[PDB]
From a paper:
We determined crystal structures of SCRIB PDZ1 bound to NS1 ESEV PBM (A281-R219-T220-I221-E222-S223-E224-V225), SCRIB PDZ1 bound to NS1 ESKV PBM (A281-R219-T220-I221-E222-S223-K224-V225) and PDZ3 bound to NS1 ESKV PBM (A281-R219-T220-I221-E222-S223-K224-V225). It appears that the conserved His in each domain found on the α2 helix, PDZ1 H793, PDZ3 H1071 and PDZ4 H1170A is an important position even when this was not obvious from the SCRIB PDZ1:ESEV structure, whereas in the SCRIB PDZ1:ESKV and SCRIB PDZ3:ESKV complexes a clear role for this His could be identified. The PDZ1 mutant H793A abolished binding with both the ESEV and ESKV PBM. SCRIB PDZ1 displays a higher affinity to β-PIX (3.3 ± 0.3 µM), compared to both NS1 ESEV (21.4 ± 1.7 µM) and ESKV (30.0 ± 0.9 µM) PBMs. SCRIB PDZ1:ESEV and SCRIB PDZ1:ESKV superimposed with SCRIB PDZ1:β-PIX with RMSD values of 0.77 and 0.75 Å, respectively.
Scribble is a highly conserved regulator of cell polarity, a process that enables the generation of asymmetry at the cellular and tissue level in higher organisms. Scrib belongs to the LAP (leucine-rich repeats and PDZ domain) protein family, and features sixteen LLRs (Leucine-rich repeats), two LAP-specific domains (LAPSDa and LAPSDb) and the four PDZ domains (PDZ1, PDZ2, PDZ3 and PDZ4). The influenza A virus NS1 protein was shown to bind to human Scribble (SCRIB) via its C-terminal PDZ binding motif (PBM). Examination of the SCRIB PDZ:NS1 complexes showed that the NS1 peptides are bound in the canonical ligand-binding groove formed by the β2 strand and helix α2.
Numbering used by the authors:
A (entry chain D): 20 to 24
B (entry chain A): 720 to 733, 738 to 801, 805 to 814
Write the structure that this text describes.
Amino acid sequence: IESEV
Amino acid sequence: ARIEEEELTLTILRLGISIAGGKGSTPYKGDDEGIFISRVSEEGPAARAGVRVGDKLLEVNGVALQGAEHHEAVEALRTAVQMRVWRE
């Protein structure tokens, strides 16, 4: 899961 | 003559990164459920501050993310942010 930050 | 692994105290100043992993989600590396830096925009603040893809998020702004859930790692990172990471 690549979450944007 | 080489570096096998190291820990850094990199302080970014706005993030241009994409954290992955976290306990309870398919791990970024083969057997490490820890929070990882998966994508780093070349231009963004994290890039300039020394953050690289593959670094292991250990602590963010004094909060420890060593073995923490995904939203814990995101909540810690969503003006100025200092992160401490492990490399190779």
